[PDB]
Amino acid sequence: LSPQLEELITKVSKAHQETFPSLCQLGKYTTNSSADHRVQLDLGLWDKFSELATKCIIKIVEFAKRLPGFTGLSIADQITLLKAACLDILMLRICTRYTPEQDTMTFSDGLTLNRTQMHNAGFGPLTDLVFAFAGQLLPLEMDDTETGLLSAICLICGDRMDLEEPEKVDKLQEPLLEALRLYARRRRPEQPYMFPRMLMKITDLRGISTKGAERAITLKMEIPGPMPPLIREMLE
Ligand SMILES: CCCCCCCCCCCCO[C@H]1O[C@H](CO)[C@@H](O[C@H]2O[C@H](CO)[C@@H](O)[C@H](O)[C@H]2O)[C@H](O)[C@H]1O
Ligand SMILES: CC1=C(/C=C/C(C)=C\C=C\C(C)=C\C(=O)O)C(C)(C)CCC1
Ligand SMILES: [Cl-]
């Protein structure tokens, strides 16, 4: 045991909780927009969804800047990491707020959309794969600390193309991996496969995000103007 590792766990947990409202703390609310049938795109829903996405991108940057050592990387490397991982983290975030009984996902302001509305907001042919990912995330029963640490591990990764100092990024990731294993095993000692299961979710997350990037291309043709600039920074 080391005090430094325990401090890292709590720092990351706090950074996550303070940039990602929990489903339980949110005042959920609904919309009646295009709620029953799948359409190509409901522009009202796209407007609301894309605005929320911009806000969450800013929150993910805020989260990143609170991760120990992140701001010690070159600005170029910080941007490179954020561009590489933002969509992964957005996916993890929305899927964490999945309510299976109601077949809904809840955004950071409490906006709660059913599957059809998620489709109509822009997810389109990606919707059911996203819900399937959320469904397969559930049994892991991850808590906020674990979700925070996993998000940090997804972001701080030395394999990203065009990194100036990949070995430096590698070194920053090391304690995050150690922290997640220590925490996961302590919390649920009778479920020792939880750590490796969590790590394998990273690969699943990358897979769904690649599909997300593909969806963005087709979505660009359906929208009446360009996507919001921070969304373009994430995708383009
Ligand atoms: C994925 C690609 C990544 C590319 C890197 C982009 C990093 C840019 C992040 C913005 C950094 C500056 O952030 C600073 O100004 C932003 C714009 O006024 C604010 O951004 C936002 O803040 C509020 C709460 O987060 C939001 O409800 C508002 O939409 C907006 O004002 C930040 O609260 C502020 O701390
Ligand atoms: C942004 C964006 C996309 C993905 C959004 C995802 C995957 C999650 C959004 C999460 C939010 C916005 C959570 C919150 O508010 O807590 C897709 C690929 C559809 C293409 C259009 C732009
Ligand atoms: Cl570009």
CB of 174 closer than 8 Å to CB of 228: no
Total domains present in the chain? 1
Mutational test site, ligand 1, from 18, 52, 57, 58, max ligand atoms within 8 Å of CB: 58
Mutational test site, ligand 2, from 40, 94, 205, 232, max ligand atoms within 8 Å of CB: 94
Of all residues in the chain, what percent are helix, strand and coil, respectively (each to 5)?
A: 65, 5, 30
Q: Is 21 in the pocket of ligand 2 (CB under 6 A)?
A: no
Mutational test site, ligand 2, from 61, 93, 106, 133, max ligand atoms within 8 Å of CB: 93
β-strands 104-106, 98-99 pairing: antiparallel
CB of 85 closer than 8 Å to CB of 154: yes
Nearest ligand for residue 234 CA: 1
CB of 232 closer than 8 Å to CB of 226: yes
Angle (CA) 38-204-217 rounded to 5° is 45
DSSP 227: P
Please give the full DSSP string across 86-103, using - where no structure is assigned. Answer: HHHHHHHHHHHTEETTTT
Q: Is 199 in the pocket of ligand 1 (CB under 6 A)?
A: no
- Residue 113 CA, chain-centre distance (Å), reads 17
CA distance linking residue 98 with residue 94, whole number of Å: 7
CB of 119 closer than 8 Å to CB of 36: no
Cα-Cα-Cα-Cα dihedral sign, residues 94, 152, 21, 44 = negative
Phi, psi of 135 (to 5 degrees): -60, -40
CA distance linking residue 184 with residue 26, whole number of Å: 26
CB of 176 closer than 8 Å to CB of 153: yes
Specified resolution (Å): 1.7
Three-state DSSP state, 112: strand
- Please name the residue that has the structure tokens 């969804």: 49
CB of 105 closer than 8 Å to CB of 94: yes
DSSP 124: G
Distance from the CA of 3 to the center of ligand 3, in angstroms?
42
Which residue, 173, 188, 197, 232, is CA-closest to 50?
232
Q: Is 28 exposed, middle or buried (0-12, 13-18, 19+ CB in 10 A)?
A: middle
Please give the full DSSP string across 7-49, using - where no structure is assigned. Answer: HHHHHHHHHHHTTS--TTTS--B---TT-SS--S--HHHHHHH
CATH at 108: 1.10.565.10
Encode 105-118 in three state secondary structure.
Answer: EECCCCEEEEHHHH
Which residue, 153, 145, 169, 142, is CA-closest to 206?
153
Beta sheet of 98-99, edge-to-edge order:
98-99, 104-106, 112-114
Angle (CA) 192-95-225 rounded to 5° is 150
Which residue, 103, 76, 91, is CA-closest to 161?
76
Q: Is 20 in the pocket of ligand 2 (CB under 6 A)?
A: no
Three-state DSSP state, 104: strand
Structure tokens at 38: 């799948």
Could you identify the atom of ligand 1 that is nearest to the CA of residue 86? 1
- Please name the residue that has the structure tokens 């910080």: 78
CA distance linking residue 178 with residue 183, whole number of Å: 9
Residues spanned by the domain of 50: 1-236
Question: Max CA-CA distance within the chain?
Answer: 56
CA distance linking residue 146 with residue 164, whole number of Å: 29
CB of 80 closer than 8 Å to CB of 162: yes
Structure tokens at 48: 């609301």
Method: X-ray
> Please, which residues bridge with residue 124 across strands?
none
